[PDB]
Amino acid sequence: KVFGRCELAAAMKRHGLDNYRGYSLGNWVCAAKFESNFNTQATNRNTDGSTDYGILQINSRWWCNDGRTPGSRNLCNIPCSALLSSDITASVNCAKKIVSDGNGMNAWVAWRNRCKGTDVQAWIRGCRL
Ligand code: NA
């Protein structure tokens, strides 16, 4: 599913991301935009052989099981395919684990490079929430 901007903001707010670990909703919307272009079925193979999955491009090296990333962990205890659903529950619950891990949202390279330090509120402007 390809979410619209305000559609995803509202969904992310219902799933508990607004201000989660101090990150305002616009941070999460900005990250999703640049990770996946709001597409829950986005996948990207990394050169280390791991794969990123879903609207927040969560990586199989640490976070989910895909059966083809040797020596990896599955810290969110999910198949990676769960991160591709139209239902964002698995992606949100796993993102909550990631952002709690010590480096905050810096774990998302696209957030650090394209969202961090910007007026992320623009991402939720004009939305009903
Ligand atoms: Na894994």
Swiss-Prot record:
Disulfide bonds join C6-C127, C30-C115, C64-C80, C76-C94. SMART domains: LYZ1. One of its GO terms (biological process) is cell wall macromolecule catabolic process. Substrate binds at D101. In the egg white and polymorphonuclear leukocytes. It catalyses: Hydrolysis of (1->4)-beta-linkages between N-acetylmuramic acid and N-acetyl-D-glucosamine residues in a peptidoglycan and between N-acetyl-D-glucosamine residues in chitodextrins. Its EC number is 3.2.1.17. Keywords: Allergen, Antimicrobial, Bacteriolytic enzyme, Disulfide bond, Glycosidase, Hydrolase, Secreted, Signal. It is an enzyme of class 3 (hydrolase). InterPro entries: Glyco_hydro_22, Glyco_hydro_22_CS, Glyco_hydro_22_lys, Lysozyme-like_dom_sf. One of its GO terms (cellular component) is endoplasmic reticulum. One of its GO terms (molecular function) is lysozyme activity. The active site is at E35, D52. SUPFAM superfamilies: Lysozyme-like. Residues 1-129 form the C-type lysozyme domain. It is found in: Secreted. Belongs to the glycosyl hydrolase 22 family. Lysozyme C is capable of both hydrolysis and transglycosylation; it also shows a slight esterase activity. It acts rapidly on both peptide-substituted and unsubstituted peptidoglycan, and slowly on chitin oligosaccharides. Monomer. Lysozymes have primarily a bacteriolytic function; those in tissues and body fluids are associated with the monocyte-macrophage system and enhance the activity of immunoagents. Has bacteriolytic activity against M.luteus. This is Lysozyme C. It comes from Gallus gallus.
